[PDB]
Amino acid sequence: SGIVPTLQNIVATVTLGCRLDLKTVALHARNAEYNPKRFAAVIMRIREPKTTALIFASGKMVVTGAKSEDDSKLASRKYARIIQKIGFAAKFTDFKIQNIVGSCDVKFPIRLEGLAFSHGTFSSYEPELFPGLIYRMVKPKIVLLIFVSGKIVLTGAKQREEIYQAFEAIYPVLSEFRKM
DNA sequence: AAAAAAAAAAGGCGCCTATAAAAGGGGTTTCAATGTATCTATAACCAGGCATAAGTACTAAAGGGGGTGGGG
C-alpha cells in the first residue's frame, strides 16, 4: 500500500493496588475534577505525555490519550507517582493496553455504497445515521470506519500490529472502490 | 416620498450520532408478593301468609229403669 496508519489513541488500565479516597485525591492533585454525582471516579490530566486518567476508589485506573505504548506506560507511572506523592500506598501494577486506535488517508475518494453492497456481511453503511461505513474485519478483529474522503479509522486493536495488518487487508478493497 | 416598525432570513456556534477498550459506588424509578375496608355470590336468618291434619267441644241421637203421687 505504501502507507502506515498513525496511532492516535491508546487506552490502558493499571491496578495501583490500594484503596483510594477520591475526595482527597481531587483535593490535593492539580487539574483534577471529581463529581461523584455523575461518575464515581477522579478525572485527572497531565501534559507529558498529554493524557487523561480515570482514577477509582478501588485503586484502579484507566489512562487514555496516549499515542504510543511507551507514552502510555510512562503516563501511567506519573499518575501512580502523584497518587503516592499525595499519600497513598499506590504501586504501578498490572499495566495493560486495552485498545489502540489509528487513522489513515489513502488520498483518494471512495464509493462507499458500492463497498457496502459488495461486502454486506462485514460493512454497515447508512449515511442517515453516520456518514462513514463501518467495516467489521474478522482477521484481525479490527473495526474500521471508512469515509468518502479516503480517511480511515481503525480501532479495537490490542497490538499496534493489528492496526497495520487491518489496513493492509482493507487497502485492496478500498482501491477497488476508488472513485475515478 | 419619506421615516419607521415588524418580519423573514442568513451566518455562525455548539453538540449529537456511530467507533473504539476498560477499573469501583450511589442515584432514582418500576415492580414483586402479601394484606385493610368493601364488593361479589352463598348459606342461613327471622316473621308473615296459606293449606292439611289432629283434637275439641258441641250438639245430637235413642234406649230404658225406678220411684213417687194420684185415682179407683
mmCIF file of C-alpha atoms (C1' of nucleotides) in Angstrom:
data_model
loop_
_atom_site.group_PDB
_atom_site.id
_atom_site.type_symbol
_atom_site.label_atom_id
_atom_site.label_comp_id
_atom_site.label_asym_id
_atom_site.label_seq_id
_atom_site.Cartn_x
_atom_site.Cartn_y
_atom_site.Cartn_z
ATOM 1 C CA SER A 1 0.000 0.000 0.000
ATOM 2 C CA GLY A 2 2.885 2.316 0.852
ATOM 3 C CA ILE A 3 1.063 3.928 3.786
ATOM 4 C CA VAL A 4 1.382 3.336 7.504
ATOM 5 C CA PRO A 5 -1.550 4.105 9.777
ATOM 6 C CA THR A 6 -0.865 6.585 12.573
ATOM 7 C CA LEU A 7 -1.589 5.580 16.157
ATOM 8 C CA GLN A 8 -3.910 8.235 17.603
ATOM 9 C CA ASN A 9 -5.053 6.884 20.927
ATOM 10 C CA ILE A 10 -4.146 4.148 23.385
ATOM 11 C CA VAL A 11 -6.236 3.078 26.370
ATOM 12 C CA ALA A 12 -4.543 1.238 29.223
ATOM 13 C CA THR A 13 -5.534 0.007 32.684
ATOM 14 C CA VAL A 14 -3.378 -0.011 35.809
ATOM 15 C CA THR A 15 -4.039 -1.512 39.245
ATOM 16 C CA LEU A 16 -2.402 0.699 41.895
ATOM 17 C CA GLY A 17 -3.130 -1.968 44.484
ATOM 18 C CA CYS A 18 -4.612 0.058 47.361
ATOM 19 C CA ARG A 19 -7.963 1.702 48.166
ATOM 20 C CA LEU A 20 -8.335 5.423 47.448
ATOM 21 C CA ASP A 21 -10.207 8.387 48.921
ATOM 22 C CA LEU A 22 -11.267 10.068 45.712
ATOM 23 C CA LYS A 23 -12.341 13.139 47.661
ATOM 24 C CA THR A 24 -8.777 13.502 48.938
ATOM 25 C CA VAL A 25 -7.154 12.929 45.551
ATOM 26 C CA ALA A 26 -9.356 15.585 43.996
ATOM 27 C CA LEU A 27 -8.285 17.960 46.769
ATOM 28 C CA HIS A 28 -4.525 17.511 46.576
ATOM 29 C CA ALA A 29 -3.952 16.856 42.871
ATOM 30 C CA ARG A 30 -3.981 19.713 40.352
ATOM 31 C CA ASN A 31 -6.066 19.519 37.174
ATOM 32 C CA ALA A 32 -8.427 17.053 38.815
ATOM 33 C CA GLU A 33 -12.200 17.039 38.682
ATOM 34 C CA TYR A 34 -14.434 14.907 40.883
ATOM 35 C CA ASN A 35 -18.218 14.852 40.534
ATOM 36 C CA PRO A 36 -19.406 11.547 42.085
ATOM 37 C CA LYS A 37 -22.996 12.515 41.271
ATOM 38 C CA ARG A 38 -22.204 11.682 37.628
ATOM 39 C CA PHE A 39 -19.146 9.430 37.674
ATOM 40 C CA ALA A 40 -17.586 7.663 40.664
ATOM 41 C CA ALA A 41 -14.002 8.485 39.708
ATOM 42 C CA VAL A 42 -11.479 11.308 39.660
ATOM 43 C CA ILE A 43 -10.566 12.594 36.225
ATOM 44 C CA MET A 44 -7.003 13.836 36.061
ATOM 45 C CA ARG A 45 -4.860 15.093 33.183
ATOM 46 C CA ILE A 46 -1.155 15.662 32.708
ATOM 47 C CA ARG A 47 0.783 17.390 29.931
ATOM 48 C CA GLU A 48 3.682 14.980 29.411
ATOM 49 C CA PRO A 49 2.691 12.744 27.903
ATOM 50 C CA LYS A 50 -0.581 14.515 27.108
ATOM 51 C CA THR A 51 -3.095 12.059 28.578
ATOM 52 C CA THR A 52 -6.147 11.753 30.855
ATOM 53 C CA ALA A 53 -6.534 9.261 33.704
ATOM 54 C CA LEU A 54 -9.712 7.929 35.299
ATOM 55 C CA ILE A 55 -8.867 7.058 38.915
ATOM 56 C CA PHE A 56 -11.203 4.894 41.004
ATOM 57 C CA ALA A 57 -11.792 4.380 44.718
ATOM 58 C CA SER A 58 -10.693 0.780 44.217
ATOM 59 C CA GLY A 59 -7.207 1.996 43.339
ATOM 60 C CA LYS A 60 -7.557 1.011 39.677
ATOM 61 C CA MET A 61 -7.279 3.466 36.808
ATOM 62 C CA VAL A 62 -7.626 3.935 33.059
ATOM 63 C CA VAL A 63 -5.148 6.041 31.107
ATOM 64 C CA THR A 64 -6.287 7.450 27.766
ATOM 65 C CA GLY A 65 -4.984 9.696 25.021
ATOM 66 C CA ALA A 66 -1.513 8.196 24.754
ATOM 67 C CA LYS A 67 -0.137 7.910 21.219
ATOM 68 C CA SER A 68 2.470 5.188 21.778
ATOM 69 C CA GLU A 69 2.903 2.155 24.040
ATOM 70 C CA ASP A 70 5.806 3.885 25.796
ATOM 71 C CA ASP A 71 3.909 7.137 26.443
ATOM 72 C CA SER A 72 1.055 5.065 27.860
ATOM 73 C CA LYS A 73 3.236 3.193 30.350
ATOM 74 C CA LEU A 74 5.142 6.401 31.130
ATOM 75 C CA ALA A 75 1.999 8.456 31.711
ATOM 76 C CA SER A 76 0.559 5.641 33.841
ATOM 77 C CA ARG A 77 3.660 5.775 36.005
ATOM 78 C CA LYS A 78 3.287 9.525 36.548
ATOM 79 C CA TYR A 79 -0.306 9.235 37.700
ATOM 80 C CA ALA A 80 0.636 6.485 40.141
ATOM 81 C CA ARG A 81 3.503 8.660 41.313
ATOM 82 C CA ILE A 82 1.078 11.504 42.024
ATOM 83 C CA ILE A 83 -1.295 9.285 43.980
ATOM 84 C CA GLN A 84 1.698 8.223 46.061
ATOM 85 C CA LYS A 85 3.016 11.770 46.449
ATOM 86 C CA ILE A 86 -0.433 12.612 47.824
ATOM 87 C CA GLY A 87 -0.219 9.955 50.484
ATOM 88 C CA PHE A 88 -1.371 6.545 49.298
ATOM 89 C CA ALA A 89 0.381 3.170 49.173
ATOM 90 C CA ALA A 90 -0.143 3.166 45.414
ATOM 91 C CA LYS A 91 2.018 0.910 43.244
ATOM 92 C CA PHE A 92 2.390 0.531 39.464
ATOM 93 C CA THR A 93 0.810 -2.883 38.812
ATOM 94 C CA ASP A 94 -0.899 -4.897 36.073
ATOM 95 C CA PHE A 95 -0.198 -2.377 33.277
ATOM 96 C CA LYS A 96 -2.128 -3.499 30.173
ATOM 97 C CA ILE A 97 -3.097 -1.794 26.894
ATOM 98 C CA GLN A 98 -6.791 -2.422 26.183
ATOM 99 C CA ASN A 99 -7.336 -0.539 22.929
ATOM 100 C CA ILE A 100 -5.385 1.150 20.146
ATOM 101 C CA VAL A 101 -6.906 3.467 17.549
ATOM 102 C CA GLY A 102 -5.206 4.551 14.342
ATOM 103 C CA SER A 103 -6.087 6.660 11.291
ATOM 104 C CA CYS A 104 -5.082 6.828 7.625
ATOM 105 C CA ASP A 105 -5.547 8.750 4.466
ATOM 106 C CA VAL A 106 -5.401 6.739 1.260
ATOM 107 C CA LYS A 107 -5.610 10.106 -0.556
ATOM 108 C CA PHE A 108 -8.424 9.108 -2.940
ATOM 109 C CA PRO A 109 -12.264 9.195 -2.677
ATOM 110 C CA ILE A 110 -14.302 6.049 -2.020
ATOM 111 C CA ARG A 111 -17.655 4.936 -3.371
ATOM 112 C CA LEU A 112 -18.931 3.621 -0.035
ATOM 113 C CA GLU A 113 -22.306 2.176 -1.116
ATOM 114 C CA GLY A 114 -20.563 0.027 -3.666
ATOM 115 C CA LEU A 115 -18.198 -1.254 -0.979
ATOM 116 C CA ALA A 116 -21.104 -1.928 1.378
ATOM 117 C CA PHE A 117 -23.148 -3.816 -1.221
ATOM 118 C CA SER A 118 -20.061 -5.859 -2.118
ATOM 119 C CA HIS A 119 -19.076 -6.757 1.476
ATOM 120 C CA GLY A 120 -22.533 -6.832 3.041
ATOM 121 C CA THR A 121 -21.613 -9.278 5.783
ATOM 122 C CA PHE A 122 -18.850 -7.017 7.162
ATOM 123 C CA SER A 123 -20.000 -3.493 6.463
ATOM 124 C CA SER A 124 -22.924 -1.433 7.727
ATOM 125 C CA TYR A 125 -23.496 1.812 5.833
ATOM 126 C CA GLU A 126 -26.403 4.172 6.378
ATOM 127 C CA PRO A 127 -25.320 7.810 5.944
ATOM 128 C CA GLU A 128 -28.563 8.793 7.644
ATOM 129 C CA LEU A 129 -27.115 7.558 10.965
ATOM 130 C CA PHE A 130 -23.419 8.060 10.372
ATOM 131 C CA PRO A 131 -21.559 9.320 7.257
ATOM 132 C CA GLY A 132 -18.830 6.680 7.464
ATOM 133 C CA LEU A 133 -19.022 2.996 6.597
ATOM 134 C CA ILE A 134 -18.452 0.552 9.478
ATOM 135 C CA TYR A 135 -16.368 -2.402 8.414
ATOM 136 C CA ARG A 136 -16.069 -5.199 10.974
ATOM 137 C CA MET A 137 -12.975 -7.157 9.954
ATOM 138 C CA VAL A 138 -12.620 -10.743 11.106
ATOM 139 C CA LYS A 139 -8.880 -11.306 10.953
ATOM 140 C CA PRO A 140 -7.544 -9.362 12.616
ATOM 141 C CA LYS A 141 -10.590 -8.350 14.639
ATOM 142 C CA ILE A 142 -10.497 -4.643 13.937
ATOM 143 C CA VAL A 143 -13.317 -2.237 13.268
ATOM 144 C CA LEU A 144 -12.757 0.290 10.502
ATOM 145 C CA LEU A 145 -14.630 3.496 9.780
ATOM 146 C CA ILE A 146 -14.306 4.194 6.051
ATOM 147 C CA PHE A 147 -15.160 7.655 4.736
ATOM 148 C CA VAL A 148 -15.826 9.060 1.292
ATOM 149 C CA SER A 149 -12.730 11.216 1.660
ATOM 150 C CA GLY A 150 -10.311 8.303 1.836
ATOM 151 C CA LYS A 151 -9.848 8.862 5.556
ATOM 152 C CA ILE A 152 -9.654 5.610 7.509
ATOM 153 C CA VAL A 153 -10.174 4.916 11.224
ATOM 154 C CA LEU A 154 -9.026 1.607 12.679
ATOM 155 C CA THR A 155 -9.834 0.561 16.239
ATOM 156 C CA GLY A 156 -10.222 -2.452 18.510
ATOM 157 C CA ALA A 157 -6.573 -3.486 18.396
ATOM 158 C CA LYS A 158 -4.521 -4.591 21.398
ATOM 159 C CA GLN A 159 -1.218 -4.729 19.484
ATOM 160 C CA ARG A 160 -0.232 -1.922 17.109
ATOM 161 C CA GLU A 161 0.485 -4.653 14.578
ATOM 162 C CA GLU A 162 -3.234 -5.434 14.217
ATOM 163 C CA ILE A 163 -3.905 -1.860 13.013
ATOM 164 C CA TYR A 164 -1.190 -2.327 10.397
ATOM 165 C CA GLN A 165 -2.450 -5.753 9.303
ATOM 166 C CA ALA A 166 -6.028 -4.455 9.257
ATOM 167 C CA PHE A 167 -5.052 -1.607 6.960
ATOM 168 C CA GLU A 168 -3.101 -3.832 4.566
ATOM 169 C CA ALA A 169 -6.080 -6.177 4.272
ATOM 170 C CA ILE A 170 -8.540 -3.375 3.510
ATOM 171 C CA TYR A 171 -6.366 -1.424 1.073
ATOM 172 C CA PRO A 172 -7.169 -3.638 -1.960
ATOM 173 C CA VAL A 173 -10.927 -3.258 -1.471
ATOM 174 C CA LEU A 174 -10.526 0.459 -0.748
ATOM 175 C CA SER A 175 -8.615 0.752 -4.024
ATOM 176 C CA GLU A 176 -11.226 -1.327 -5.838
ATOM 177 C CA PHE A 177 -13.929 1.171 -4.887
ATOM 178 C CA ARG A 178 -11.873 4.270 -5.542
ATOM 179 C CA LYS A 179 -13.894 6.990 -7.275
ATOM 180 C CA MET A 180 -12.028 7.603 -10.537
ATOM 181 C "C1'" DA B 1 -41.943 60.375 -0.711
ATOM 182 C "C1'" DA B 2 -40.425 59.647 3.356
ATOM 183 C "C1'" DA B 3 -39.332 57.529 8.032
ATOM 184 C "C1'" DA B 4 -40.492 53.976 10.775
ATOM 185 C "C1'" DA B 5 -41.517 49.178 12.833
ATOM 186 C "C1'" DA B 6 -42.057 44.327 12.054
ATOM 187 C "C1'" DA B 7 -40.814 40.402 9.753
ATOM 188 C "C1'" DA B 8 -38.001 36.508 7.444
ATOM 189 C "C1'" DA B 9 -33.642 35.163 6.534
ATOM 190 C "C1'" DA B 10 -28.669 34.398 6.803
ATOM 191 C "C1'" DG B 11 -24.224 33.126 9.094
ATOM 192 C "C1'" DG B 12 -22.048 31.351 12.986
ATOM 193 C "C1'" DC B 13 -21.580 28.452 17.181
ATOM 194 C "C1'" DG B 14 -22.118 24.313 19.872
ATOM 195 C "C1'" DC B 15 -23.204 19.189 20.429
ATOM 196 C "C1'" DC B 16 -25.222 14.672 18.553
ATOM 197 C "C1'" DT B 17 -24.972 10.178 16.076
ATOM 198 C "C1'" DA B 18 -21.525 5.647 15.241
ATOM 199 C "C1'" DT B 19 -16.033 3.688 16.722
ATOM 200 C "C1'" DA B 20 -13.039 2.045 19.899
ATOM 201 C "C1'" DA B 21 -11.489 -0.854 25.201
ATOM 202 C "C1'" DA B 22 -11.626 -0.995 30.377
ATOM 203 C "C1'" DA B 23 -11.090 -0.261 36.805
ATOM 204 C "C1'" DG B 24 -15.411 0.918 41.764
ATOM 205 C "C1'" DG B 25 -20.120 3.172 44.135
ATOM 206 C "C1'" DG B 26 -24.567 5.681 44.736
ATOM 207 C "C1'" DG B 27 -28.871 7.688 42.464
ATOM 208 C "C1'" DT B 28 -33.807 7.348 41.275
ATOM 209 C "C1'" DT B 29 -37.767 4.560 39.245
ATOM 210 C "C1'" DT B 30 -40.530 0.440 38.471
ATOM 211 C "C1'" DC B 31 -42.295 -3.944 40.068
ATOM 212 C "C1'" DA B 32 -42.628 -8.381 43.415
ATOM 213 C "C1'" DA B 33 -45.781 -10.878 46.803
ATOM 214 C "C1'" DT B 34 -48.756 -10.227 50.927
ATOM 215 C "C1'" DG B 35 -52.586 -7.595 53.376
ATOM 216 C "C1'" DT B 36 -57.398 -3.472 55.470
ATOM 217 C "C1'" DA B 37 -62.225 -1.809 54.116
ATOM 218 C "C1'" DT B 38 -65.735 -3.053 50.577
ATOM 219 C "C1'" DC B 39 -67.539 -5.999 46.789
ATOM 220 C "C1'" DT B 40 -69.473 -10.391 44.870
ATOM 221 C "C1'" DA B 41 -72.050 -14.800 45.110
ATOM 222 C "C1'" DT B 42 -73.778 -18.451 49.063
ATOM 223 C "C1'" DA B 43 -75.616 -20.003 53.081
ATOM 224 C "C1'" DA B 44 -78.743 -19.098 56.782
ATOM 225 C "C1'" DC B 45 -81.969 -15.938 59.461
ATOM 226 C "C1'" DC B 46 -86.160 -14.041 61.069
ATOM 227 C "C1'" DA B 47 -91.707 -13.029 60.589
ATOM 228 C "C1'" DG B 48 -95.857 -13.354 57.878
ATOM 229 C "C1'" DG B 49 -99.328 -15.857 54.785
ATOM 230 C "C1'" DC B 50 -101.931 -20.083 53.025
ATOM 231 C "C1'" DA B 51 -103.246 -25.327 53.128
ATOM 232 C "C1'" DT B 52 -103.678 -30.038 55.591
ATOM 233 C "C1'" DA B 53 -104.039 -32.930 59.715
ATOM 234 C "C1'" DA B 54 -105.196 -33.736 64.802
ATOM 235 C "C1'" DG B 55 -108.073 -32.694 68.892
ATOM 236 C "C1'" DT B 56 -112.030 -30.043 70.790
ATOM 237 C "C1'" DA B 57 -116.250 -29.292 72.452
ATOM 238 C "C1'" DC B 58 -120.805 -29.100 70.830
ATOM 239 C "C1'" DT B 59 -124.937 -30.542 69.750
ATOM 240 C "C1'" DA B 60 -127.168 -34.897 68.580
ATOM 241 C "C1'" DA B 61 -129.410 -39.058 68.962
ATOM 242 C "C1'" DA B 62 -132.058 -43.211 71.041
ATOM 243 C "C1'" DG B 63 -132.798 -46.581 74.736
ATOM 244 C "C1'" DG B 64 -134.596 -47.716 79.311
ATOM 245 C "C1'" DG B 65 -135.405 -48.459 84.711
ATOM 246 C "C1'" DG B 66 -137.115 -46.760 89.216
ATOM 247 C "C1'" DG B 67 -139.659 -44.118 92.451
ATOM 248 C "C1'" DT B 68 -143.469 -41.157 93.851
ATOM 249 C "C1'" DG B 69 -148.183 -39.454 93.508
ATOM 250 C "C1'" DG B 70 -152.927 -39.825 92.168
ATOM 251 C "C1'" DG B 71 -157.138 -42.444 91.230
ATOM 252 C "C1'" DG B 72 -160.200 -46.390 91.682
#
